[PDB]
Write a protein that binds this ligand. Structure first.
Ligand SMILES: CCCCCCCC
Length: 499
């Protein structure tokens, strides 16, 4: 669940700690992740956290209760994903069509104790199952209302049709929309086709994708992405046991917005090679290189080396180093667009960064303890300083510790804490959870988050499971109503399902 540079959140994790709005509320508890309200990894800023859904990029994403696992990748091992990934990758993984029919609903409602703060109700479903020996489907969708504190609506739906062409091949057809109101409106639609083959010589995954997004204003603007993607994984035994991965991306984004020659385009080509090599049982060496060619901005090399060595049964060491970048977007690279103003800038350079990490983990008898040092050294962060202009920031450093501790206090009691500590050119967060499996069915959390001048915020949380079909969860957040961010608030959730 925790290792160096990488964190994993489970359905069971989310299910115990229902968010109020989006998954950022849970993802921010992972080591090296803050909200600044958008996800920020290892100090690097939001614009360098990359958000994929089933490995596909996207620019509440996914109903929490529909998420199977969230994978968080930080720092060097995340360079491979290109621009937007210098701080790392959040990868949100969904539930998938199944040989048997499957429904779930969820209702959740969070009521602030202060009427100043505004209440939330959200609501979602997932249906999945077979049609045919060769066809399977899965639909999920959500509706979300959040009153204005003295509101805002979201609706999304996404469908997947899955076709088993062969026992060794699957195509996925996907499509759906998200819509948001409150005036400010946004409508987004999405199409994808996916081929996954398992072959004698390894595996393959090709992706086509289209995204539109329209935004209305208190004038309209439309954005569209085309993507193509190929990835091979070929295990080899030559010299040493290893798994060669080869991958290519092609990417077009178009923007039309007559708040400013109203159209703007950009194409992206890339190759990457990672080779994960077993030098010896217990030692992993994993070089890789990624070429990103940008239509405005030329070429960007992102070479990386990562490695791991085991130190007996109970310890492991991990280090890596990698170059990474962020290319500017169409708003920032084009002087004709003015936002309120701030102006694009045709002579912008891409942010570059050299990200280094080194960590140890201990693991024994349900005990887990990791510490990781990181240091990122980055250049031309794009930043806003009358008519202002997007600019390149001068050099900077980030450096922290990530720690993760997990302690079984008893068979059905466990204590867990997650630490993030950085200096930039000296703050820390601590996220802790005391968990009690009182019964098979009954489950209890105390949770705290401590910022550091330092201050504290504690929640309590309870859950009961009647059956496969029904379960219930309820909780107080900000127990002690610490103010001078949200006050104390009561929430309650019900999940029905017919697996
Ligand atoms: C099944 C193909 C649907 C394509 C819709 C295109 C709308 C512009």
């Amino acid at each position: 669940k925790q290792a160096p540079g990488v964190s994993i959140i489970t359905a069971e994790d989310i299910r115990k700690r229902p968010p109020v709005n989006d998954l950022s509320e849970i993802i921010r508890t992972m080591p090296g992740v803050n909200l600044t309200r958008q996800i920020d990894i290892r100090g690097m800023g939001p614009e360098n956290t990359l958000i994929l859904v089933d490995g596909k990029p996207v620019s509440n994403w996914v109903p929490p209760e529909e998420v199977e696992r969230i994978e968080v990748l930080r720092g060097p091992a995340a360079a491979r994903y290109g621009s937007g990934a210098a701080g790392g990758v959040v990868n949100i993984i969904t539930k998938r069509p199944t040989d048997r029919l499957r429904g779930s609903m969820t209702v959740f409602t969070n009521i602030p104790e202060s009427s100043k703060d505004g209440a939330t109700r959200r609501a979602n479903f997932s249906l999945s199952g077979p049609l045919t020996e060769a066809l399977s489907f899965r639909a999920y969708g959500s509706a979300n209302k959040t009153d204005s504190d003295d509101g805002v609506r979201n609706r999304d739906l996404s469908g997947m049709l899955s076709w088993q062409v062969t026992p060794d091949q699957v195509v996925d057809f996907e499509a759906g929309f998200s819509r948001q109101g409150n005036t400010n409106r946004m409508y987004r639609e999405n199409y994808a086709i996916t081929h996954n083959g398992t072959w004698s010589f390894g595996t393959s995954r090709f992706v086509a994708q289209y995204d539109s997004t329209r935004n209305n204003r208190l004038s309209a603007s439309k954005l569209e992405n085309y993507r193509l993607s190929g990835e091979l994984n070929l295990p080899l035994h030559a010299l040493f046991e290893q798994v060669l991965t080869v991958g290519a991306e092609w990417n077009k984004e178009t923007l039309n917005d007559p708040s400013s020659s109203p159209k703007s385009k950009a194409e992206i080509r890339a190759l990457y090679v990672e080779d994960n090599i077993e030098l010896r049982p217990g030692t992993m060496l994993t070089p890789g290189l990624r070429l990103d060619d940008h239509s405005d901005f030329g070429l960007n090399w992102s070479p990386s080396l990562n490695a791991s060595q085991t130190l007996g049964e109970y310890f492991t060491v991990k280090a890596g180093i990698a170059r990474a970048f962020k290319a500017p977007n169409l708003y920032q690279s084009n002087p004709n667009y003015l936002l309120y103003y701030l102006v694009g800038n045709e002579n912008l350079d891409a942010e570059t960064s050299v990200n280094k990490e080194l960590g140890i983990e201990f693991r024994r008898d349900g005990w887990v303890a990791g510490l990781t040092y990181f240091r990122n050294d980055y250049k031309n962060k794009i930043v806003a300083p009358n008519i202002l202009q997007w600019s390149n920031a001068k050099k900077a450093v980030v450096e922290g510790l990530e720690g993760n501790l997990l302690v079984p206090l008893h068979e059905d009691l466990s204590w867990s804490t997650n630490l993030t500590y950085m200096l930039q050119s000296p703050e820390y967060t601590l996220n802790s959870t005391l968990d009690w499996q009182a019964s098979e069915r009954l489950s209890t959390q105390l949770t705290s988050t401590i910022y550091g001048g330092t201050y504290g915020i504690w929640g309590v949380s309870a859950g009961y499971t009647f059956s496969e079909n029904l379960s219930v969860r309820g909780g107080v957040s900000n127990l002690f109503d610490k103010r001078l961010e949200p006050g104390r608030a009561y929430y309650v959730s019900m999940t029905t399902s017919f697996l």
